Design a protein around this motif. Structure first.
Motif, short mmCIF file in Angstrom:
data_model
loop_
_atom_site.label_atom_id
_atom_site.label_comp_id
_atom_site.label_asym_id
_atom_site.label_seq_id
_atom_site.Cartn_x
_atom_site.Cartn_y
_atom_site.Cartn_z
N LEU A 110 0.85 -1.22 0.00
CA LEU A 110 0.00 0.00 0.00
C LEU A 110 0.88 1.26 0.00
CD1 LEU A 110 -2.57 -1.42 2.53
CD2 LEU A 110 -3.22 -0.55 0.28
N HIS A 111 2.10 1.19 -0.55
CA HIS A 111 2.96 2.37 -0.84
C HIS A 111 2.32 3.18 -1.97
CE1 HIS A 111 6.65 4.80 -1.21
NE2 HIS A 111 6.92 4.32 0.01
N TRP A 112 2.69 4.46 -2.09
CA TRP A 112 2.25 5.38 -3.17
C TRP A 112 2.47 4.76 -4.56
CZ3 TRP A 112 -1.04 8.81 -4.21
CH2 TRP A 112 -0.92 9.62 -5.34
N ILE A 113 3.59 4.04 -4.74
CA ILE A 113 4.08 3.55 -6.07
C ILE A 113 3.39 2.22 -6.43
CG2 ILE A 113 6.21 4.86 -6.25
CD1 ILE A 113 7.74 2.51 -5.00
N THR A 114 3.47 1.22 -5.55
CA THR A 114 3.14 -0.21 -5.86
C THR A 114 1.65 -0.38 -6.15
OG1 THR A 114 3.11 -0.62 -3.50
CG2 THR A 114 5.10 -1.29 -4.65
N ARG A 115 0.77 0.42 -5.54
CA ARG A 115 -0.71 0.33 -5.71
C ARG A 115 -1.08 0.48 -7.19
NH1 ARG A 115 -1.15 3.96 -1.61
NH2 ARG A 115 -2.61 5.28 -2.77
N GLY A 116 -0.62 1.57 -7.82
CA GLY A 116 -0.75 1.80 -9.27
C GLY A 116 -0.14 0.67 -10.08
N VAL A 117 1.06 0.22 -9.70
CA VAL A 117 1.85 -0.83 -10.41
C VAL A 117 1.02 -2.12 -10.45
CG1 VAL A 117 3.97 -2.26 -10.34
CG2 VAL A 117 4.12 0.18 -9.84
N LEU B 216 -0.85 -4.04 -13.41
CA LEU B 216 -0.34 -5.42 -13.64
C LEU B 216 -1.51 -6.41 -13.69
CD1 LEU B 216 2.93 -6.89 -12.33
CD2 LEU B 216 0.87 -8.30 -12.22
N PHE B 217 -2.44 -6.33 -12.73
CA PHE B 217 -3.59 -7.27 -12.61
C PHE B 217 -4.63 -7.00 -13.70
CE2 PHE B 217 -3.32 -10.18 -8.95
CZ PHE B 217 -2.07 -9.82 -8.49
N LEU B 218 -4.80 -5.74 -14.13
CA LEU B 218 -5.64 -5.41 -15.32
C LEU B 218 -5.01 -6.04 -16.57
CD1 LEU B 218 -8.00 -4.21 -16.71
CD2 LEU B 218 -6.95 -1.96 -16.61
N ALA B 219 -3.68 -5.91 -16.73
CA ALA B 219 -2.91 -6.52 -17.84
C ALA B 219 -3.05 -8.05 -17.80
CB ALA B 219 -1.46 -6.09 -17.78
N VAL C 83 -2.89 -9.26 -2.89
CA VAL C 83 -2.20 -8.15 -3.62
C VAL C 83 -3.25 -7.23 -4.26
CG1 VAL C 83 -0.56 -7.60 -5.49
CG2 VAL C 83 -0.11 -9.53 -3.97
N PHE C 84 -4.17 -7.78 -5.05
CA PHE C 84 -5.12 -6.98 -5.88
C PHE C 84 -6.24 -6.42 -4.99
CE2 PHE C 84 -9.23 -7.18 -8.12
CZ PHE C 84 -9.09 -6.18 -9.06
N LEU C 85 -6.77 -7.22 -4.05
CA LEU C 85 -8.00 -6.86 -3.29
C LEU C 85 -7.71 -5.76 -2.27
CD1 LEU C 85 -10.95 -7.30 -3.23
CD2 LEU C 85 -10.65 -9.27 -1.74
N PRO C 86 -6.63 -5.82 -1.45
CA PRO C 86 -6.29 -4.70 -0.56
C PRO C 86 -6.20 -3.34 -1.27
CG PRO C 86 -4.96 -6.60 0.00
CD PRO C 86 -5.69 -6.95 -1.28
N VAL C 87 -5.61 -3.31 -2.47
CA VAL C 87 -5.37 -2.08 -3.27
C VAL C 87 -6.70 -1.54 -3.81
CG1 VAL C 87 -4.21 -1.13 -5.34
CG2 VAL C 87 -2.99 -2.72 -3.84
N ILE C 88 -7.56 -2.41 -4.35
CA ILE C 88 -8.92 -2.02 -4.84
C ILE C 88 -9.76 -1.56 -3.64
CG2 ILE C 88 -11.11 -2.99 -5.71
CD1 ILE C 88 -9.37 -2.22 -8.01
N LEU C 89 -9.63 -2.22 -2.48
CA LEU C 89 -10.31 -1.79 -1.22
C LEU C 89 -9.77 -0.43 -0.77
CD1 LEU C 89 -10.64 -5.13 0.79
CD2 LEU C 89 -12.47 -3.82 -0.27
#
Ligand code: POV
Ligand code: POV
Ligand code: CLR
Lengths: 953, 953
Positions: free
Chosen positions: A509-516, A520-523, A924-930
């Protein structure tokens, strides 16, 4: 509602954990009472019962065929090759220059003759009837099915062109043609035989019977393989088919047949061990596949017994909080791990026992894999429960019973949701047409239900006992040590939770990795949604088998060397008046009969073997019948003698039946109803002779069903599928055959006096297996949609969740499923009933990875979404990872030594793939979307919980 | 332990009563899931399947007989009487003066002839085969069993002496004997027929065929009854037996037979309605008994539906404390009564459904009575629970959930004891040989188990709901009234408890009455122990039937008018060499054969019909065989012609076979092995004719089983039991027959060459029913001892009772049981499987009356024994009386209108008797014995209870 489940299971837990031993006993009694039924197991091995819906179309066609023509004869082949033998030229002097392959040497054919002749006189003991079962008892006899001898059995070979006669092989004569003389050899007879198989006399200065020993014309495609076109001299394989009479399952003659099959395999193994640098022998038997799929289950079953120990050890070492190195032996949860494994094994044995009691016939390959999936599903619940119980701060002046009750109260709704989702998923997966996957799905469903019912009572009672031993400071497993000097008091902060809180949550949940990770998961979803369309439908053969089976080599030889695949039978149902004029017209192919008829349509279809999967035309009986009634001295009637008003067999040549079969001929041979009825049963028993080679007994003796009155009930037409290799080929072949049969019926129903219920269907032997792959995609897609709806519906009732969470749940499940299907098609895993039940189990399981994190984010009161995602990740992500993922993977990674390509491919690989995708998405994907589009704070869901803690304490 | 059950069920109760609706649903789901199986019921009606252990001896003998001689033919009788007809004298002039009974008038015999002749040509429709089923298809034909006609069926009658010929009845001739002439009539032929039935020619100036129409000699005992000795003219009944061929249960010919039987009954009813003042017709059919036992179950089943309402109303009006007359409609427990009835009906339906699923064939007469006993057993628990709950002082600041939990905690051990005692008792009662009582016992056992399991969950949940409605001041059943103006607060002291405390306890435990009742109950035990020895073993016929059935009149006529009962068959097993010399010697009875042989022993046995139940000697086939080989022109061989080396039937009289059947005769006719083998099958087909009346086909055609080689496998000998009336007579007849067969085998095993496995057994038709009464007393006594041990053993573990109480409990149970058996024998109730299961249920139930009072005295702290007995009587005697006794009696008193003598006798009377004796002992005898030789005070059993109330609150 969720808070009411909290109170409900809290109360239940507080009670049970206050009466542990009595409930251990009251829960063990019914489990053993159900598990005692494992002795009632009646195992299936027959591929027909395990892999065909008996209420399906293909099985109805098979039943019909079995009623009206008897069952399909059992085939036992031996494919030979001499790859160490070089080709040699030999001139024929009647056909011209030819190139003869190395395998067509004399000595090799002499060795084959010796092998075949030995395989004729082969008997067994058969201790069932206490008499030596010999070949003539059980062998398939097309001519003379009664009083059969060792020289009347359907033994096709290249040596049936010399009737298995050593002197006919070694025979050489001197032929003078066009003024020049040379030595005519067996090769000349072979070449004259291949180009025209139905010739009683050779045409090369030799009176050789080109017809076979048992008296039916051996076609080239049943004697040689590997040629391409009519260049039979360049044949790279010698085939030898020991056809046996098949019987229903209740006939001891079938048992005797299988005894002969076992003896055949032993003899063939002896022959293969004999000839090393001469032949490359590849054999089988009609029993071989049933023998190879049901051999491994006893060999690789100890590896699953290891799979349980791998999970026991993990659960035992992962729950024991070791932070002193002086009291590791007092606190490490050995009893809990052993109890957990015992509970899930109790559940699977109870399920199998219950389904043994109802008389459901469960195969070995079904009981081999049920316990694995039930354990991998039913260890996650006990792990999450123990973690939650260990993480609860025991309030001051609260006994251990209320504490365990409260823990259960907290993590009961999530456990119930998990179990209901998986049970429902398996029970909806059970709608597959195959009886094997149906039985399996139902078994796993009931096992998960009973496992949850045991986890609520038996395991909570055991956790209460274990915790009581902990409070007393007694050792891990041996609770009889009577504690030593007072061990130092046990207070820690957790290592897993520490590691996560320090490294993971800030990193993820860093500024950088959330976007990454979001990109990545959309790709990944995008690539998967593309790669899904490159999927291969069909569980092709060579997968049911191990990697070390001789049948692999045999199937390689079939798919490489054969020139016509399975023979198809265009069976004509009842309700056709064959005795009529237009009746015979629309089935005939010669001059006189109407254009675009039955045989003509099939003959036209076999022009393009790629578009229509028929390599050779239909051997029609009406054509050879009307040709038999041609005045060419085949059918005759006696004019005088005591045998008046009957048939004169063509075998005699007396002056007492010189009258031709029928009246004057000028146009077309069209016998009237009486002529047809009087001449047909004579045709179906006119054994072919040198007088005229035409005769019904040769290949049509059993291809027409006659009633006592003389009415043709049904009649089948034999055509040959081109070499079928893949499962796609088998399915497209069945589809093209069905389409052709339908097109023919559309024309045959136009004949006046045909019952519109009359239909022609293209029956072959491998139709009961490769019928579903026509329409498995609609059925599978429907099943997955009908599994996604109620799982979500239950998910957003049991967790008391809003729609802003529910849509993220459903999205995450769909994303996991599409990703699974993408990588399934990409790896090279096919799509069928097995993959379908695994994808359904995946929809059921992935809830474990998703629902926990979604809820742990829902019931959270941190100011900003990032902090809510952080704490949700740390607590419940630690639970999800450590429990779910690492109770799936140490189980799955063991299946990778199954030795059976079926399990090795469709369980190990699929469950590994689903576990890793569930892990990745859920953590990885669910925490970031949440963190991005999560719900609102909603404090009256953490505030509403303490109404449920002090009330029912 | 008892205090631990207190805590256990308190905790469970407190939980359930805190989650009422969810548990109502979770308990209703499995009950309905089990009760849905009532549609799988496959009911038995056949008396053979309901009333015989298939692994018994009599059934093994029946199986043997059915294998080796075919099944016993079906008998259809018509017993006639003319009681309004006066006797008349008639002189014979060849036999002397005779007195002819009124029934032997001409016109009456003419009417019988018309009835019989109409009953020959009777057909049915039989919509199964769509063809008119006629008599010749199904009728029993001893002669000519193939191509049978309407004049070849076994129709015995007094008119078989005139072959059913009206002119032979009306025939009169003029006989001149000793110089005097008179009119010879039918009466003279009848009298010459009765004294010698096997005469082809009469001896009174008439060539009348005295032999029957179908061609076998009709014996007097099958044509006339009511005579005593050889005075056949004084016959008071005319019998007419329409014998039919019997078949196995899987034969449609048996269905067709039963259709003909129904038509026969309809025709006979028509005949009975026709002749009112002429005949007193009493008829039956082989189907009639199966029809009469299985008719009532649908007629008197609504009376049981009333029995449930009688109990519902009582429980509804007995728990509603009415002490205001303004709030009776708010507090009267309608919901509890309805719930209680619903629970017990759920339990019985669940039990029956579960036993329908296992494919156990449960008759109608079994499902008729199960629910009654399960309800009478399973209402006492809910009544005691509600009473205890209503009598508990709700402590200040205690919610209703903990209060209900505490009530259940108090009265759970006693309820569990009751249910376990009854379950165990029924499941040990299930060891009866009869399948009917076995199925019944198992059903009631499972029903009581499920009823207790429902009473713990479903009923406690419902009591919680009902109590919640009470606290809200809403109406009895309609809980939607929304309470009116505040009703006056409800505080009372109890009316029942008040009445008891004021009147009963001082009256019972007075100085005077204690001695009186102790002496009275010792006197009752004494009288009962005397009257027990005057018991009658055997469920005799006329009890299975209603009181209004025609079969009652038929059985009266059988037991009054018949002269020989059921015919017995002394079946000889395989392993006897009949073809030998000593073989024939030991079975022959004439001159030449050894003394004290088979037939001679039976002939000697029938001298004393009272000691040995055989009224007529055995019709031996070897005797009539060796008499057939006597050179008297019966057997002959052809000397010339194309029929050389074969038998010459005695029917011909040509000069071509004047050679006698054997060599010179001087001593005894003893044919050698070859002579025996060549002459026996000729004997068994030599139809009797006028030439010589001897012939095997007449009565021995089917009485010898011959293999293809010509070996006699088995051979039966026909003897007649004297008129068997009681069940004692049937049992003693079987016993005496068995003893006689054993004595004969003891002699026949001495013949050289007899396999020692060879045995003779006296098979009759009614042996599969009246075999148990040989040894029902040992089995019954064993079952009651094995029910008294574990009940007591569980009683003094569950109540935590000492031995000083346990011995008083066991004494009270034994005293109730002896008193029950005494009054059972005294009233006139017989002892069999039905009475046995009722006595076992009595041992199970009487614990309800005894254990409660014994415990309520055990846990008591009053200074003197009288005060302990007083308070124990008041509290728990009020509970026992009001609950147990008045939930048994209003149920039982309804069974007294069952209309089926079986239930009317063995359920109503026995359960009434057991209830009243349980009531008397439990409420009168036990308090006084507890006042005298009760236990010590033992305060650490009332002191140890509050450890269980505040701990698990
Ligand atoms: C089945 C066949 C048989 C079932 C009977 C077998 C159970 C006996 C085991 C008892 C035992 O192990 O010792 C126990 C004896 O102390 C007790 O508490 C005994 C309680 C008896 C209650 C049984 C009622 C079940 C009936 C209903 C049946 C319905 C079943 C239907 C389900 C399908 C020890 O007690 P504890 O457990 O160690 O408690 C310690 C906790 N404490 C310290 C707080 C006190
Ligand atoms: C079976 C098929 C299906 C079983 C499911 C059907 C049950 C649904 C009924 C719920 C209902 O009626 O409303 C309830 C919803 O409030 C709740 O408390 C809901 C609690 C849900 C717990 C269910 C878990 C059962 C799973 C385990 C399955 C194992 C079964 C195995 C047995 C063979 C109302 O609650 P209440 O009852 O009125 O409480 C009032 C008391 N109070 C006022 C103190 C709050
Ligand atoms: C427990 C379950 C889900 C997995 C094991 C069952 C499956 C893998 C087993 C049971 C029956 C088996 C099938 C029976 C019929 C045949 C014979 C041949 O024509 C191709 C292989 C094939 C199609 C088998 C493949 C493996 C098979 C499908």
């Amino acid at each position: 509602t969720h808070t009411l489940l909290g109170q409900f299971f809290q109360g239940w837990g507080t009670w049970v954990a206050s009466w542990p031993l009595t409930i251990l006993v009251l829960s063990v009694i019914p489990v053993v009472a159900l598990a005692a039924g494992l002795v009632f197991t009646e195992l299936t091995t027959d591929p027909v019962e395990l892999w065909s819906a008996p209420n399906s179309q293909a099985r109805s066609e098979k039943a019909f065929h079995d009623q009206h023509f008897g069952p399909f004869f059992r085939t036992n082949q031996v494919i030979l090759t001499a790859p160490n033998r070089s080709s040699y030229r030999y001139d024929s002097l009647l056909l011209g220059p030819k190139n003869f392959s190395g395998i067509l040497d004399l000595d090799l054919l002499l060795e084959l003759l010796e092998l075949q002749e030995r395989l004729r006189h082969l008997q067994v003991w058969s201790p069932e009837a206490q008499r030596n079962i010999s070949l003539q008892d059980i062998c398939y006899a097309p001519l003379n099915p009664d009083n059969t001898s060792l020289y009347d059995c359907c033994i096709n070979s290249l040596l049936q062109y010399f009737q298995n006669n050593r002197t006919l092989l070694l025979l050489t004569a001197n032929q003078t043609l066009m003024g020049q003389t040379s030595q005519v050899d067996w090769k000349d007879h072979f070449l004259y035989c291949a180009n025209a198989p139905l010739t009683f006399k050779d045409g090369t200065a030799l009176a050789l019977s080109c017809m076979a020993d048992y008296g039916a014309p051996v076609f080239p495609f049943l004697a040689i393989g590997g040629y391409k076109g009519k260049d039979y001299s360049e044949a790279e394989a010698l085939i030898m088919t020991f056809s046996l009479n098949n019987y229903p399952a209740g006939d001891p003659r079938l048992a005797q047949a299988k005894l002969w099959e076992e003896a055949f395999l032993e003899e063939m193994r002896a022959f293969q061990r004999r000839m090393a640098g001469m032949f490359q022998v590849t054999f089988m038997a009609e029993r071989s596949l049933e023998d190879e799929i049901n051999r491994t289950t006893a060999e690789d079953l100890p590896i699953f017994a290891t799979s349980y120990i791998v999970i026991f050890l993990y659960i035992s070492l992962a729950l024991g909080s070791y932070s002193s190195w002086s009291r590791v032996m007092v606190d490490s949860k050995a009893t809990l791990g052993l109890g957990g494994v015992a509970v899930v094994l109790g559940a699977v044995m109870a399920a199998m026992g219950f389904f043994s009691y109802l008389g459901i016939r469960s195969s070995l390959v079904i009981l081999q894999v049920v316990p694995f999936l039930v354990l991998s599903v039913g260890a996650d619940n006990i792990f999450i429960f123990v973690l939650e119980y260990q993480r609860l701060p025991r309030r001051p002046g609260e006994p251990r019973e209320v504490h365990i009750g409260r823990a259960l109260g907290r993590v009961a709704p999530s456990m119930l949701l998990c179990s209901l989702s998986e049970a429902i998923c398996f029970f909806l997966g059970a709608l597959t047409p195959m009886p094997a996957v149906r039985t399996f799905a139902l078994t796993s469903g009931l096992a998960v239900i009973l496992d949850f019912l045991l986890q609520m009572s038996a395991f909570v009672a055991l956790l209460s006992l274990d915790s009581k031993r902990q409070e007393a400071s007694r050792l891990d497993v041996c609770c009889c040590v009577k504690p030593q000097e007072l061990p130092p008091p046990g207070q820690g902060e957790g290592l897993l939770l520490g590691f996560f809180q320090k490294a993971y949550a800030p990193f993820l949940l860093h500024w950088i990795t959330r976007g990454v990770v979001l990109l990545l998961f959309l790709a990944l979803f995008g690539v998967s949604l593309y790669s899904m369309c490159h999927i291969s439908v069909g569980l092709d053969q060579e997968l049911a088998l191990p990697k070390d089976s001789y049948l692999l080599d045999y199937f390689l030889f079939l798919n490489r060397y054969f020139e016509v695949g399975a023979p198809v039978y265009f069976v004509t149902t009842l309700g056709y008046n064959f005795s009529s004029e237009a009746g015979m017209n629309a089935i005939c192919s010669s001059a006189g009969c109407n254009n675009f008829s039955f045989t003509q349509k099939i003959q036209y279809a076999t022009e393009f073997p790629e578009q229509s999967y028929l390599a050779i035309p239909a051997s029609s009986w009406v054509d050879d019948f009307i040709d038999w009634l041609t005045p060419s001295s085949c059918c005759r009637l006696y004019i005088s003698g005591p045998n008046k008003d009957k048939f004169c067999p063509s075998t005699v040549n007396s002056l007492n039946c010189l009258k031709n079969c029928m009246s004057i001929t000028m146009g077309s041979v069209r016998p009237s109803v009486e002529q047809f009825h009087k001449y047909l049963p004579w045709f179906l028993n006119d054994r072919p002779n040198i007088k005229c080679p035409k005769g019904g007994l040769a290949a049509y003796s059993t291809s027409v069903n006659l009633t006592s009155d003389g009415q043709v009930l049904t009649s089948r037409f034999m055509a040959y599928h081109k070499p079928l290799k893949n499962s796609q080929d088998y399915t497209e072949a069945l589809r093209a055959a069905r389409e052709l049969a339908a097109n023919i019926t559309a024309d045959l129903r136009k004949v006046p006096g045909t019952d519109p219920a009359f239909e022609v269907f293209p029956y072959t032997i491998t139709n009961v297996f490769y019928e579903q792959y026509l329409t498995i995609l609609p059925e599978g897609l429907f099943m997955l949609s009908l599994c996604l709806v109620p799982t979500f519906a239950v998910s957003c009732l049991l967790l008391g969740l809003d729609l802003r969470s529910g849509l993220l749940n459903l999205l995450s499940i769909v994303m996991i499923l599409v990703d699974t299907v993408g990588f399934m098609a990409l790896w090279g895993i096919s799509y069928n009933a097995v993959s379908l039940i695994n994808l359904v189990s995946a929809v059921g399981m992935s809830v474990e990875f998703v629902s926990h994190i979604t809820r742990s984010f829902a019931i959270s009161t941190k100011p900003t979404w990032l902090e809510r995602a952080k704490e949700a990740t740390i607590s419940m992500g630690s639970a999800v990872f450590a429990g779910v993922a690492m109770t799936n993977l140490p189980g799955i990674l063991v299946l990778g030594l199954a030795k059976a390509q079926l399990i090795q491919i469709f369980f190990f690989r699929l469950n590994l793939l689903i576990t890793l995708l569930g892990l990745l998405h859920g953590l990885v994907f669910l925490p970031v979307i949440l963190s991005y589009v999560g719900p609102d704070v909603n404090p009256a869901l953490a505030l509403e919980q303490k109404r449920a803690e002090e009330a029912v304490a």
